[PDB]
Amino acid sequence: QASLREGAAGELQLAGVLDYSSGPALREQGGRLIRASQAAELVVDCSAVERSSSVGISLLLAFIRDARKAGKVLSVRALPDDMREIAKVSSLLEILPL
Amino acid sequence: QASLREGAAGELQLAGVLDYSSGPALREQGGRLIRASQAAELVVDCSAVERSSSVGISLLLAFIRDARKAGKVLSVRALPDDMREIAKVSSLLEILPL
Amino acid sequence: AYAVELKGLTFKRGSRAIFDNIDVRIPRGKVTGIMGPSGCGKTTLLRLIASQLRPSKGEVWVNGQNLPQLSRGDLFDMRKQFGVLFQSGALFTDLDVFENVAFPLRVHTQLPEEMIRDIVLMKLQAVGLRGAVELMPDELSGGMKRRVALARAIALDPQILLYDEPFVGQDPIAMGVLVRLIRLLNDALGITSIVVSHDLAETASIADYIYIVGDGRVLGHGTPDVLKETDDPRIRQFVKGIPDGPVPFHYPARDYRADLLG
Amino acid sequence: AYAVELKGLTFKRGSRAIFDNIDVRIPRGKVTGIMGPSGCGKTTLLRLIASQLRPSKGEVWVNGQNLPQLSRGDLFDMRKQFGVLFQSGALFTDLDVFENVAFPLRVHTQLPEEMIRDIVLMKLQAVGLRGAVELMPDELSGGMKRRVALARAIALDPQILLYDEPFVGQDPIAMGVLVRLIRLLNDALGITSIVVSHDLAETASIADYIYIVGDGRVLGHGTPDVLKETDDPRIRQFVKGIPDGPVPFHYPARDYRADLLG
Amino acid sequence: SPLERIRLFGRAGLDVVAALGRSTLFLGHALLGRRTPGTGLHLLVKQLYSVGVLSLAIIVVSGLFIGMVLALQGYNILISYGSEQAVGQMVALTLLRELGPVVTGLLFAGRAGSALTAEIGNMKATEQLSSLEMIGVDPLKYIVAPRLWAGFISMPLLAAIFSVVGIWGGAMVAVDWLGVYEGSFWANMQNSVQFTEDVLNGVIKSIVFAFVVTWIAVYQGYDCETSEGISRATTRTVVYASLAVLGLDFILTALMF
Amino acid sequence: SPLERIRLFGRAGLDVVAALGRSTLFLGHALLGRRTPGTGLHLLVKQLYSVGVLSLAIIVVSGLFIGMVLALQGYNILISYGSEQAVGQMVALTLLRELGPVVTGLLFAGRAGSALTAEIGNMKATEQLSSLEMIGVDPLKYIVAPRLWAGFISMPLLAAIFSVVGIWGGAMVAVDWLGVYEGSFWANMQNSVQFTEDVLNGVIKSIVFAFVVTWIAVYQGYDCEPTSEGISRATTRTVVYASLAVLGLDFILTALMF
Ligand SMILES: CCCCCCCCCCCCCCCC(=O)OC[C@H](COP(=O)(O)O)OC(=O)CCCCCCCCCCCCCCC
Ligand SMILES: CCCCCCCCCCCCCCCC(=O)OC[C@H](COP(=O)(O)O)OC(=O)CCCCCCCCCCCCCCC
């Protein structure tokens, strides 16, 4: 359903539906195959994200737990308001930086 | 403790505190002894009742079950306040002839 | 002048300090209440003033002579003064409803088995359950299984009576009759009542001198409306919803960043 | 449209007629609440919309298509749409808290074990009970043994989630935190919530379109205010105390004068 | 952690040796404390109906089945010894000397060693017992003392009925389908049974783990916590009572072969 | 009413066969229905620990006790005849073909015949067994199927362990407490048991109960009415019915092979 492109050299973009099915596949194809480049300060722009849920939050959340491992830093920009709600529900407000 | 007298002419008196102690004593001493010697209209008067519990009402309700066996009609006069309340809770106000 | 006076009671169960130096006075004729958070020992403070449990130190003063300083043959006579209505009924599954309600009478009193029927009935027509005088507590519905227990309690015509969690977990059409009965018994008969339940709204609606118990000590006491604006942090957290306050809403986790990122 | 619709539904247990031609229409996004007297089987209406019990006849439009007319290959996928919350938690005693909240993830979804950890933690966080991610359900007090079950429910982000008498039998604190949690859930996530609890005094606050269920049929429906003045005898007897009414207060005794004398 | 596991094992070892103490004090308070105001013989009769008369349909059929098993087996192991007539002196020895009295323990402690602890634990959980002290009646001598007296005087009768039905079943199957001469069967049986060393021995052997089965069936229910507490206490009493049937069987038969 | 008394008796009698049919339907749906998502072998392992390994102490102490009882009893009975040197044949014959599986039935149906019923009963009555249907995991193939498969393959092993410990603890009293020739004990033992006629016979007799004890110990727990008393009554119905089934099916399975 969703895809991960434009990475390994800068801004890494997201696709629309981050459901439970597209969870592990997107994670794997983004977890290392994109992050391991060590190119610059990665920006993950979730612009064209139509629908998502907590699986998407953990996806964005697993996205950083390896940057913390790989030394580089990344932050999310244009976080969609639905995932904004899913995060605001839990005490997670600034644990995910933006 | 208790007492019971004034038979064969109505005006069936009753003494003070009627508890579990004075229950069966008065119950028997009025059940058959007094009841036999009686004539019609059987006025029972619990005037000098210092205090009484529901055993007192049961006793006053033991005078009705045998008056129906004895045939003599009966009614209760000078009913106290405590017995009044113990009756009002069980709503057997009409059950006791006044 | 008060019905139940607790002079410096203290209770511990295996060095637990379930109650430390508590001193509560219950006013005669007034339907008081006691309550508190989950597990503050209200149930124990009940069995304590009823001499089902022995106070480690202190004394429960009831209607004059204090209970735990008497002979068995005397405390047994004092048992005529108070009954107890436990939630979930506490009905004797062996005996039918009639013998069930007559049980406290067949113990303290040797009365004619024809006179006991009158007391049972008049004490069951009051609580309403004069019909199923022959059913078994196994068959009584979960609702009326408690009103017959109340009938058993008000047998012997006690002077005080205790209520363990009466209006908790029942439809309002049954909690309605139960609270009406708890207020009627106090008003009509003029007998003390000690409601022990954490149904805040209802207890505050019925109780006269409500006390609150928390984690081993008396958390103040007074009339209901007074405790609604006492501003005691724990008490104002209790008597309102206000999920967070002195009692922590969160569990002692390690760190929201650590447990998630490491 | 609507979340749950039961057009012309009924159900019986060995010719007992638990529900006869009943009908309920649940609005998506709002916290509807059904309730009724002791023994109307509200919980039985709960499990119907959850496809735990098969309806005798009717159809249950849950989030669109009806449930009892689906293959298991699609009903099992529709199970992802809704959770539940039974009182006393209904926690798996075999699994500690972490697996207890990860269980719905370890069934419908095949996610990397580390993603399950992040999801469960961010879920146990919202429900507060995050610290005891390694405790066992027997170690958890009855107050927090329910919030962890709620966390299990809200896993997978269900679009609707039922509640089986959540706030019944707990202090005003552990009930306040739970009602705050269901409020935060429905309001923020924008997910339906069907509070099936006979305790009206508390539900009337958190009810948007509260229903009533009794004697096996839909006993009116509306917002809490319009049911406080419903003018329906049985329903006005329910929504307030008023012990005696269409539901009796006494038992069908033969006669008081009969039993007392003869 | 090893040290904490050893601490917990020592704690359990102190508990079990303290539980026996608490159980003995409870039995003492139950059997000869005082005369409670509400007691009588009607309680003993009622609990004798729940303990014994309801446990008749289990041990009678058990006696029948184990009797035909004992006969149909010994005859097979004796068909090669030539003494197929000693079957009588077997189904009246094994089913009397050891297996008949023991199986009545393993079974009475399953029907009335478990139902007893459930009925006397659910009482503690539904507040029944705690609501008995407020009425003034001693719960031990009203609720548990009739259980003890209905277990003491109904397990020996159960064992006697079990042995009688087992002997008769072994007869019925030894004569009908096995064709053994009924005359020689009953003859050898009546001859080599030695009342004073087998019948009374089985009876005292049954009284021992009657006193010890009803004791730990009643106590384990007077000392349980909740439905999960009772659902575990009934398993605990079934296990402890089967263990105290077999162990007391060994200890007693060692004192009198 | 006497006529209504007979009505109630016939009602209970028909209820028994109705429940038996419901139980075999439940067993069918449990053993071979379908592979549910939550199912796995770890379930079987956990239950094998909850059913068998916890039931090892009871069955082993029982084996030792019942073995020394069997020996110390037969030695007395054989003393009068003079063939005491064959006591080893006796215990290995009774405690291996009749008293072994029967007592381990009466005992495995006591601990794991009541623990199982009370456990899955308390499951049913705390909605833990119903809340599994909402998640989609069929409870049969998750809650009871590992119980059934941990009763089928843990009662025969329990019976083998029980018979082994009973034989050894019979030797331990015939030899080092009553003084017979240990070599004679073991030798006369292994000449008159005929494995294919007694050992495998006892193993089959134990398997048949293993199937019929863990089936009426998990059904009676999946069928108890959901309360704190229905469960305390089911954990007695299951002990009664399982002891009765052990005894009856052992009678059958020994009349089928003497
Ligand atoms: C002719 C002589 C008369 C016979 C006299 C009868 C003796 C009575 C003794 C019975 C002891 C039981 C006390 C009550 C137990 C209780 O309720 O106490 C119950 C507690 C339970 O505590 P928990 O709460 O921790 O589970 O402990 C037990 O479970 C005890 C287990 C009972 C086992 C008894 C077996 C005794 C024989 C052992 C064999 C010895 C081995 C040697 C072999 C080489
Ligand atoms: C001389 C004639 C006398 C002989 C009589 C013969 C008796 C035969 C034995 C009886 C059986 C006892 C069972 C008691 C259970 C009960 O009553 O049943 C009672 C319960 C219902 O009772 P409730 O009312 O509590 O629901 O039913 C069940 O639990 C259902 C399961 C019972 C299983 C029956 C045994 C099945 C046999 C399978 C053998 C094949 C195995 C091979 C597989 C490899």
Side-chain angles (χ1 to χ4, degrees), chain F residues 222-256:
Chain F
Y222 187 76
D223 193 75
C224 48
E225 79 155 7
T227 165
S228 147
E229 178 71 23
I231 277 154
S232 315
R233 190 178 338 126
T235 181
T236 277
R237 285 207 308 256
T238 177
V239 179
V240 171
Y241 293 167
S243 314
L244 207 42
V246 158
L247 263 353
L249 272 193
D250 129 271
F251 157 64
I252 282 184
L253 269 302
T254 185
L256 197 128

Short mmCIF file of all heavy atoms in Angstrom, two decimals, chain F residues 222-256:
data_model
loop_
_atom_site.label_atom_id
_atom_site.label_comp_id
_atom_site.label_asym_id
_atom_site.label_seq_id
_atom_site.Cartn_x
_atom_site.Cartn_y
_atom_site.Cartn_z
N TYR F 222 -14.94 -26.64 30.92
CA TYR F 222 -15.45 -25.80 29.85
C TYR F 222 -16.97 -25.70 29.87
O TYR F 222 -17.54 -24.94 29.08
CB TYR F 222 -14.98 -26.33 28.50
CG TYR F 222 -15.31 -25.43 27.34
CD1 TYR F 222 -14.59 -24.27 27.11
CD2 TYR F 222 -16.35 -25.74 26.47
CE1 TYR F 222 -14.89 -23.44 26.05
CE2 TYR F 222 -16.66 -24.92 25.41
CZ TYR F 222 -15.93 -23.77 25.21
OH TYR F 222 -16.23 -22.95 24.15
N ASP F 223 -17.63 -26.42 30.77
CA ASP F 223 -19.08 -26.49 30.79
C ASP F 223 -19.70 -26.02 32.10
O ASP F 223 -20.92 -25.85 32.16
CB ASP F 223 -19.54 -27.92 30.51
CG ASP F 223 -21.01 -28.02 30.21
OD1 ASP F 223 -21.41 -27.64 29.09
OD2 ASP F 223 -21.76 -28.47 31.10
N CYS F 224 -18.90 -25.79 33.14
CA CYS F 224 -19.43 -25.34 34.41
C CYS F 224 -20.04 -23.95 34.28
O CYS F 224 -19.50 -23.09 33.58
CB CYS F 224 -18.33 -25.32 35.47
SG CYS F 224 -16.82 -24.52 34.93
N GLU F 225 -21.16 -23.73 34.96
CA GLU F 225 -21.80 -22.43 34.92
C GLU F 225 -20.88 -21.38 35.54
O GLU F 225 -20.18 -21.66 36.52
CB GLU F 225 -23.15 -22.47 35.64
CG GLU F 225 -23.10 -22.41 37.15
CD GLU F 225 -24.37 -21.86 37.76
OE1 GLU F 225 -25.35 -21.65 37.00
OE2 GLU F 225 -24.41 -21.64 38.98
N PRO F 226 -20.82 -20.18 34.97
CA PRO F 226 -19.77 -19.23 35.36
C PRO F 226 -20.01 -18.57 36.71
O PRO F 226 -20.52 -17.45 36.77
CB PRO F 226 -19.81 -18.21 34.22
CG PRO F 226 -21.22 -18.22 33.77
CD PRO F 226 -21.68 -19.65 33.91
N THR F 227 -19.63 -19.24 37.79
CA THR F 227 -19.68 -18.63 39.10
C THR F 227 -18.64 -19.28 40.00
O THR F 227 -17.92 -20.18 39.57
CB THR F 227 -21.08 -18.73 39.73
OG1 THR F 227 -21.00 -18.44 41.13
CG2 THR F 227 -21.64 -20.12 39.53
N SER F 228 -18.58 -18.82 41.24
CA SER F 228 -17.58 -19.33 42.18
C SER F 228 -18.03 -20.64 42.81
O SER F 228 -17.23 -21.33 43.44
CB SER F 228 -17.30 -18.30 43.27
OG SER F 228 -17.00 -18.95 44.49
N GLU F 229 -19.31 -20.97 42.66
CA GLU F 229 -19.85 -22.22 43.17
C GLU F 229 -20.04 -23.26 42.08
O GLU F 229 -19.85 -24.45 42.32
CB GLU F 229 -21.18 -21.98 43.88
CG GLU F 229 -21.84 -23.24 44.41
CD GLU F 229 -21.10 -23.83 45.59
OE1 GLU F 229 -20.37 -23.08 46.27
OE2 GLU F 229 -21.26 -25.04 45.85
N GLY F 230 -20.43 -22.83 40.88
CA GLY F 230 -20.45 -23.76 39.76
C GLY F 230 -19.09 -24.38 39.52
O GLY F 230 -18.99 -25.55 39.16
N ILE F 231 -18.02 -23.62 39.76
CA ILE F 231 -16.68 -24.14 39.57
C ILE F 231 -16.31 -25.11 40.68
O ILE F 231 -15.70 -26.15 40.43
CB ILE F 231 -15.68 -22.98 39.48
CG1 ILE F 231 -15.64 -22.42 38.07
CG2 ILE F 231 -14.30 -23.43 39.89
CD1 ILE F 231 -15.22 -21.00 38.03
N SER F 232 -16.64 -24.76 41.93
CA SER F 232 -16.37 -25.66 43.04
C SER F 232 -17.23 -26.91 43.01
O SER F 232 -16.92 -27.88 43.70
CB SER F 232 -16.58 -24.92 44.36
OG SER F 232 -15.99 -23.63 44.33
N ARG F 233 -18.31 -26.90 42.23
CA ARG F 233 -19.10 -28.09 41.98
C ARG F 233 -18.61 -28.87 40.77
O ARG F 233 -18.73 -30.10 40.74
CB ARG F 233 -20.57 -27.72 41.78
CG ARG F 233 -21.51 -28.90 41.75
CD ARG F 233 -22.95 -28.45 41.59
NE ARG F 233 -23.15 -27.07 42.00
CZ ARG F 233 -23.70 -26.13 41.23
NH1 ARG F 233 -24.10 -26.43 40.00
NH2 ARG F 233 -23.84 -24.89 41.69
N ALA F 234 -18.05 -28.19 39.78
CA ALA F 234 -17.46 -28.89 38.65
C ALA F 234 -16.16 -29.58 39.02
O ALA F 234 -15.89 -30.67 38.53
CB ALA F 234 -17.22 -27.93 37.50
N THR F 235 -15.35 -28.97 39.89
CA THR F 235 -14.11 -29.62 40.31
C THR F 235 -14.37 -30.77 41.27
O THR F 235 -13.41 -31.36 41.77
CB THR F 235 -13.17 -28.63 40.98
OG1 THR F 235 -11.97 -29.31 41.37
CG2 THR F 235 -13.80 -28.04 42.21
N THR F 236 -15.63 -31.10 41.53
CA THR F 236 -16.03 -32.32 42.22
C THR F 236 -16.75 -33.28 41.30
O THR F 236 -16.52 -34.49 41.37
CB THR F 236 -16.92 -31.98 43.42
OG1 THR F 236 -16.11 -31.63 44.54
CG2 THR F 236 -17.80 -33.15 43.79
N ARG F 237 -17.60 -32.76 40.41
CA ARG F 237 -18.17 -33.60 39.36
C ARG F 237 -17.08 -34.25 38.54
O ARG F 237 -17.20 -35.42 38.18
CB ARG F 237 -19.09 -32.78 38.46
CG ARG F 237 -20.43 -32.44 39.07
CD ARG F 237 -21.49 -32.24 38.00
NE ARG F 237 -21.07 -31.31 36.96
CZ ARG F 237 -21.50 -30.05 36.87
NH1 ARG F 237 -22.37 -29.58 37.75
NH2 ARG F 237 -21.07 -29.27 35.90
N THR F 238 -15.99 -33.54 38.26
CA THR F 238 -14.93 -34.13 37.45
C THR F 238 -14.14 -35.17 38.21
O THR F 238 -13.79 -36.19 37.62
CB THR F 238 -13.97 -33.07 36.92
OG1 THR F 238 -12.91 -33.73 36.21
CG2 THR F 238 -13.36 -32.29 38.05
N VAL F 239 -13.87 -34.97 39.49
CA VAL F 239 -13.19 -36.00 40.27
C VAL F 239 -14.04 -37.25 40.39
O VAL F 239 -13.55 -38.36 40.21
CB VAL F 239 -12.80 -35.46 41.65
CG1 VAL F 239 -12.11 -36.53 42.44
CG2 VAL F 239 -11.90 -34.26 41.51
N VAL F 240 -15.33 -37.08 40.67
CA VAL F 240 -16.24 -38.22 40.76
C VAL F 240 -16.29 -38.96 39.43
O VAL F 240 -16.05 -40.17 39.37
CB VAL F 240 -17.64 -37.77 41.18
CG1 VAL F 240 -18.61 -38.92 41.06
CG2 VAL F 240 -17.60 -37.26 42.58
N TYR F 241 -16.62 -38.25 38.36
CA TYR F 241 -16.78 -38.90 37.06
C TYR F 241 -15.48 -39.49 36.57
O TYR F 241 -15.49 -40.53 35.91
CB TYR F 241 -17.34 -37.91 36.05
CG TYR F 241 -18.75 -37.47 36.35
CD1 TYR F 241 -19.31 -36.39 35.69
CD2 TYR F 241 -19.51 -38.13 37.30
CE1 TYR F 241 -20.59 -35.99 35.96
CE2 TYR F 241 -20.80 -37.73 37.58
CZ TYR F 241 -21.33 -36.66 36.91
OH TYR F 241 -22.61 -36.25 37.18
N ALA F 242 -14.34 -38.89 36.90
CA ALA F 242 -13.07 -39.42 36.43
C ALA F 242 -12.60 -40.62 37.23
O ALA F 242 -12.06 -41.55 36.64
CB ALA F 242 -12.01 -38.32 36.47
N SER F 243 -12.81 -40.64 38.54
CA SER F 243 -12.56 -41.87 39.29
C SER F 243 -13.48 -42.99 38.82
O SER F 243 -13.04 -44.13 38.64
CB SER F 243 -12.73 -41.62 40.78
OG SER F 243 -12.09 -40.42 41.17
N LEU F 244 -14.76 -42.67 38.61
CA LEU F 244 -15.70 -43.66 38.11
C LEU F 244 -15.29 -44.18 36.74
O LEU F 244 -15.39 -45.37 36.46
CB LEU F 244 -17.10 -43.05 38.06
CG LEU F 244 -18.24 -44.04 38.19
CD1 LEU F 244 -17.90 -45.05 39.26
CD2 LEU F 244 -19.52 -43.31 38.53
N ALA F 245 -14.81 -43.28 35.88
CA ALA F 245 -14.40 -43.69 34.54
C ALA F 245 -13.13 -44.52 34.58
O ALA F 245 -13.02 -45.51 33.86
CB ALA F 245 -14.21 -42.47 33.65
N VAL F 246 -12.16 -44.12 35.41
CA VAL F 246 -10.97 -44.95 35.60
C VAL F 246 -11.37 -46.36 35.99
O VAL F 246 -10.97 -47.33 35.35
CB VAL F 246 -10.05 -44.32 36.66
CG1 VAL F 246 -9.14 -45.37 37.24
CG2 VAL F 246 -9.23 -43.21 36.04
N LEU F 247 -12.21 -46.48 37.03
CA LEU F 247 -12.58 -47.81 37.51
C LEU F 247 -13.34 -48.60 36.45
O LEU F 247 -13.01 -49.75 36.16
CB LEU F 247 -13.40 -47.67 38.79
CG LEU F 247 -12.60 -47.84 40.08
CD1 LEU F 247 -11.19 -48.27 39.79
CD2 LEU F 247 -12.58 -46.54 40.83
N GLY F 248 -14.36 -47.99 35.85
CA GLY F 248 -15.18 -48.71 34.89
C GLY F 248 -14.42 -49.11 33.64
O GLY F 248 -14.49 -50.25 33.19
N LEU F 249 -13.70 -48.16 33.05
CA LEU F 249 -12.93 -48.47 31.86
C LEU F 249 -11.77 -49.40 32.15
O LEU F 249 -11.35 -50.13 31.26
CB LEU F 249 -12.42 -47.19 31.20
CG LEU F 249 -13.41 -46.59 30.22
CD1 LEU F 249 -12.72 -45.54 29.41
CD2 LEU F 249 -13.99 -47.65 29.32
N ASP F 250 -11.27 -49.42 33.39
CA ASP F 250 -10.27 -50.43 33.71
C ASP F 250 -10.91 -51.80 33.82
O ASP F 250 -10.31 -52.80 33.41
CB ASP F 250 -9.56 -50.07 35.01
CG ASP F 250 -9.54 -51.21 35.99
OD1 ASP F 250 -10.49 -51.32 36.79
OD2 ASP F 250 -8.58 -52.01 35.95
N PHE F 251 -12.12 -51.88 34.37
CA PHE F 251 -12.84 -53.14 34.38
C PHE F 251 -13.04 -53.66 32.96
O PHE F 251 -12.79 -54.83 32.67
CB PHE F 251 -14.18 -52.98 35.09
CG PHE F 251 -15.20 -54.00 34.70
CD1 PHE F 251 -15.00 -55.34 34.98
CD2 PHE F 251 -16.36 -53.63 34.05
CE1 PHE F 251 -15.93 -56.28 34.62
CE2 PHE F 251 -17.30 -54.57 33.69
CZ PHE F 251 -17.09 -55.89 33.98
N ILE F 252 -13.50 -52.79 32.07
CA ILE F 252 -13.65 -53.18 30.67
C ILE F 252 -12.32 -53.63 30.10
O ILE F 252 -12.17 -54.76 29.62
CB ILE F 252 -14.27 -52.04 29.85
CG1 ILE F 252 -15.78 -51.98 30.10
CG2 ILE F 252 -13.99 -52.23 28.38
CD1 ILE F 252 -16.49 -50.96 29.26
N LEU F 253 -11.31 -52.76 30.16
CA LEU F 253 -10.02 -53.03 29.53
C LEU F 253 -9.26 -54.18 30.17
O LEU F 253 -8.24 -54.60 29.61
CB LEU F 253 -9.16 -51.77 29.54
CG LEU F 253 -9.28 -50.86 28.31
CD1 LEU F 253 -8.93 -51.62 27.05
CD2 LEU F 253 -10.66 -50.27 28.18
N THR F 254 -9.69 -54.69 31.33
CA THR F 254 -9.11 -55.93 31.83
C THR F 254 -9.97 -57.14 31.53
O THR F 254 -9.44 -58.26 31.46
CB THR F 254 -8.86 -55.86 33.34
OG1 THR F 254 -8.19 -57.05 33.76
CG2 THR F 254 -10.16 -55.79 34.09
N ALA F 255 -11.27 -56.96 31.33
CA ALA F 255 -12.08 -58.04 30.78
C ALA F 255 -11.80 -58.25 29.31
O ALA F 255 -12.02 -59.35 28.79
CB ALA F 255 -13.57 -57.76 30.99
N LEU F 256 -11.30 -57.22 28.62
CA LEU F 256 -10.94 -57.36 27.22
C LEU F 256 -9.61 -58.09 27.06
O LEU F 256 -9.35 -58.66 25.99
CB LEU F 256 -10.86 -55.98 26.57
CG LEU F 256 -10.88 -55.89 25.04
CD1 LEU F 256 -11.95 -54.92 24.60
CD2 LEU F 256 -9.52 -55.48 24.50
#
